Symmetry: D2
Amino acid sequence: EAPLPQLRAYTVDASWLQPMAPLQVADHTWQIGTEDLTALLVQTAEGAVLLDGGMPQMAGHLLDNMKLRGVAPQDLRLILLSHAHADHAGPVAELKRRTGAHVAANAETAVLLARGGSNDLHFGDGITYPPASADRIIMDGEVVTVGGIAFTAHFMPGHTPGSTAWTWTDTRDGKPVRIAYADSLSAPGYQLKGNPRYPRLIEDYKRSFATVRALPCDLLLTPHPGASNWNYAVGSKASAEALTCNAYADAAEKKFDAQLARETAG
Amino acid sequence: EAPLPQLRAYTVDASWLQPMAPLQVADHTWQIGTEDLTALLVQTAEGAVLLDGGMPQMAGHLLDNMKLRGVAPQDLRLILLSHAHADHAGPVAELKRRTGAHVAANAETAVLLARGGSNDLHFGDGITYPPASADRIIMDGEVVTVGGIAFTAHFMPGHTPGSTAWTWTDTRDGKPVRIAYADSLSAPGYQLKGNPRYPRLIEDYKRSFATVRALPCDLLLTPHPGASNWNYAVGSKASAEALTCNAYADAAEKKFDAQLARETAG
Amino acid sequence: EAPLPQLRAYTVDASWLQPMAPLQVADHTWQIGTEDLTALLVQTAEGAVLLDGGMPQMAGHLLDNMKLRGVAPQDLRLILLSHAHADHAGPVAELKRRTGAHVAANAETAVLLARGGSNDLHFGDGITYPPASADRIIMDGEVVTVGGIAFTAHFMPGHTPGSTAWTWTDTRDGKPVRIAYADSLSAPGYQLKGNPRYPRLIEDYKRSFATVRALPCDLLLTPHPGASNWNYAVGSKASAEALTCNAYADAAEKKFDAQLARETAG
Amino acid sequence: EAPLPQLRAYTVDASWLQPMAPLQVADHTWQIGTEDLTALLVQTAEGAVLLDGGMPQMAGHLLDNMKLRGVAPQDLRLILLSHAHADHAGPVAELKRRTGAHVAANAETAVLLARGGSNDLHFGDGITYPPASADRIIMDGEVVTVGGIAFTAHFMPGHTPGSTAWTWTDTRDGKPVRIAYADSLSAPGYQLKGNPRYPRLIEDYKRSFATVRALPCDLLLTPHPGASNWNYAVGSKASAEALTCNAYADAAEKKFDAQLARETAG
């Protein structure tokens, strides 16, 4: 007599959905997402690059901020992703339609993006979003160049099989600033041990800690700004407490090792 | 200061989600969906065919009913669709994964199914579901045969560009029963006139009325049972008030012509 | 003892592969393909449109001709298709990779393009090419606009299920010139009657003749220039003997009706 | 005046295309491909598994051999792949269409298979084949079970990014036989050093040698039988000279290290 349950929406903290004006990270790099979701616009002489887009409903806000930066919709050349979950890749389909941008991603990110996050290794169908196609498949270490700005992929599987850190070198004053945009190193609610859908999950995480430790980095950013102790809401002091790559990886690994012991204990 | 709106789920009438035991339509054809969502199981000597699956959360109920009919998950050979909206194609992805079934559909249904109903001509991204791939592309009039039971496709564009009616001949007692499973002929909230995403919408609907009128049919069924005056909840009297194809098409066209005049008037 | 046969390549007349310099059709429209394969470049204030690309090996030649016209690879915004056979859509995948262009096509063209022409309704796997993805799905009559130039789709199924004629209005001197780029109306070696993979082939062809007859047209062009009596090799006299839409459709229908009678007779 | 070059077909040694009758490997495992292309049929109580299919033109021969083994087309449940090149995955699309089988593969194999081998990291578009879709995405170490026979994936990137070795335990007499079906460890004509499309090629090969060395294995087989010193043409003595996993990996690594030094020297 009880009916089947209704579908539930992917609802998130209001701060994840709180718009912010563009916040400059370096000479050509801007945070244009929300207070608690990173979306990085990199502006070049030959068009703009977007790294991540946040939630699906953020598409219009992203275009507004791009316009504030002098970037028309057609000027967006490329979208890069940390990972293909709804809260970071949510608006990619709409953005492609409205900009003509291409998406570059590794094969794992591509196949998750192409099914809109459904059949997730850990979340099933609970966190879906409009599917999008990857236009260029990226390999570990491959360099993607737009307007003379070179973006290098560093695979860091774990949070998703396709999780990627992206590095590039901007400037601030006249000195180079090596930026590292590293994916999450958390395993929120994952079954870590003997996971049939991810048998080498622990090995991949362990390797990804070491990958993040060794990234070329003067300024680390993360898809959730709090993961690297950014505070987008405080303007020019936003980066003041930012973690190093070593401190970020160290903290992730201690959190991981605890969760692993607590899984052995229940 | 107002955050972006949260995502909203596709919630439906409880009767759409009310499970029912299998209800026999003819010697090999059974309703195995819910009280207000049709899902037809056709059982052959060489496996079963499923026409439509209802909402995404109906996958487990469909498999339970199949099991009641003696059909193991692996015995489902083929899934056919009326149209690729979330309330009729919702569980197809999961069903493919759990059964090994193939999906046959026309090109329009295939491309909508492959994007999980996102970027709908009328509903945008408001009604998405897990994407699935079509294994065989069907043309208008093409015959799909499983276990000697021949299913013929009749394209009836309008409700969706890929909307399809499926016909086959079952038996009841020892007499043939030509079944027609016809898609919806409604345009719920659609902009009918000068729709940029569907410029020939009116012409297609007009043609589809005539297609439905001429279907070979002794027993009409529809994805929403109320559209053809079925009442699944009353057991063996469920078909008593069922419409003919002529009466179904007639009523749809009068509803369409009214909505069209009311669009000219606002 | 006989081994399986080797794969055979899709080889074509040398004139299909004979490069030509850009040939101006109207103020913004240029033939930039080969002597016997049409590829139309339309240049706008906000980027270029390419209608068809010919054979797969024509990608580099197309880019050379675009460069001659002042169009850098990144300036190509959009690719449109008459139909997704190897000799007209052959280089689309490579062109997308090298230009960032998006492809717009109807659902039938999209699914054939996505399987690289394999499992063709008539040719099987004999004429394959690198698959490409459609970025925007087009409906019959839908208008695609780039740089203020409006391209309208007119579906003309037959040669392929997704065959499309594209119309737009250019200028010559200061007078408008309605261009019609119409797909082939031939059925080369097709089984016309009772074709299981295309049961309504005859009806679609018959309707497509009438569609082509009624196209808005001052200048007709076709994917094979000889089909509309163009001669690309003679420069400014190339259009002199060009057919009207009526004469093109008339001739196609007489050819079709003959082939149909000869199929009844063997 | 010279026309563009014609397309060239992927032609291979006649022995790759020389049909053979089924050759028993263990109680449930049979070679059913050609003399020089492995295609392994594993027969279970609940349907058959095919590991690799060889060249595209081998589809009909594979079905003939399956029929010889008592496996009807519909009885093939699953296709697994070593890698998605035309000479081992060639007939997968046709096989899916004619059998209802599902394909399981890792994300890299899936994306290469989905573009029919086009845009290969090393071969470009020179070796294409009809694209096919993967129905289940596999992770490293994941177990796929059909009829109680468990197949484990072991990723061994290098020959292709998605190259996979598959292991399972059959029987011979009444003793277990751990079979290892390992992909190629060759780099035929690849640029090994500083390859922009595969920056970590050397690291992946180096790791894959060690993966192959440690596979659980009593009987090694390879997609090209000569790579592991099988001789399918000599019947029951076919396995006599077969390599161990250690000897196969050792020989591959010495070949790789030589080619690497010869690349430094030209």
